[PDB]
Amino acid sequence: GXXXXXXXXXXXXXXX
Amino acid sequence: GXXXXXXXXXXXXXXX
Amino acid sequence: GXXXXXXXXXXXXXXX
Amino acid sequence: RMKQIEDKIEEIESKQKKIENEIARIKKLLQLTVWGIKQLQARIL
Amino acid sequence: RMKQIEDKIEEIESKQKKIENEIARIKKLLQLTVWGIKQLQARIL
Amino acid sequence: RMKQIEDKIEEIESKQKKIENEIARIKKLLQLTVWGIKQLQARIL
Ligand SMILES: [Cl-]
Numbered sequence: 001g002x003x004x005x006x007x008x009x010x011x012x013x014x015x016x
Numbered sequence: 017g018x019x020x021x022x023x024x025x026x027x028x029x030x031x032x
Numbered sequence: 033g034x035x036x037x038x039x040x041x042x043x044x045x046x047x048x
Numbered sequence: 049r050m051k052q053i054e055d056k057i058e059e060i061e062s063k064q065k066k067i068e069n070e071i072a073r074i075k076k077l078l079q080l081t082v083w084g085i086k087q088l089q090a091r092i093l
Numbered sequence: 094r095m096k097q098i099e100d101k102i103e104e105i106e107s108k109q110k111k112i113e114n115e116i117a118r119i120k121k122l123l124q125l126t127v128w129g130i131k132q133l134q135a136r137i138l
Numbered sequence: 139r140m141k142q143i144e145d146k147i148e149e150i151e152s153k154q155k156k157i158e159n160e161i162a163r164i165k166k167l168l169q170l171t172v173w174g175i176k177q178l179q180a181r182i183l
Pocket residue numbers: 063064067108109112153154157
């Protein structure tokens with residue numbers, strides 16, 4: 001989850 | 017969000 | 033909620 | 049016979065409109081939950 | 094020709110029922126998330 | 139007269155496909171919120 005482990009504080013909710 | 021800044025502890029989730 | 037008071041740490045989100 | 053087809057169709061269109069209205073309600077509530085998770089995460093960090 | 098129209102229609106009705114069942118599942122899960130956010134906010138406050 | 143029935147039908151099918159695509163988008167976002175609540179609860183406990 002969360003955009004394939006992107007991090008970034010959540011990535012804005014996986015980009016919405 | 018949250019009901020146009022209504023506060024109220026969340027306003028019951030913006031009234032559901 | 034949460035699966036009729038099942039507990040279980042949330043029951044995996046009420047089984048998804 | 050086909051006249052019936054027109055009515056069943058007005059019926060399908062009616063159910064479609066109800067489905068679209070329900071989807072619009074779902075999207076608004078889903079947006080509130082997205083906002084709520086955002087507020088809780090900001091509090092936790 | 095119109096007979097085909099009746100079958101395509103039974104087909105549209107079938108897909109509509111599937112959509113309504115999916116929407117019902119989505120609403121139940123969305124309600125669980127609303128409850129979950131409510132529990133986490135109460136813990137945080 | 140029935141020819142019109144075929145077009146209105148292609149139209150209903152088109153709206154159905156749009157509804158199915160919207161439902162797929164909703165399900166993906168709902169899954170992200172489920173994951174987000176899971177992460178926040180784990181942090182709180
Ligand atoms: Cl439909």
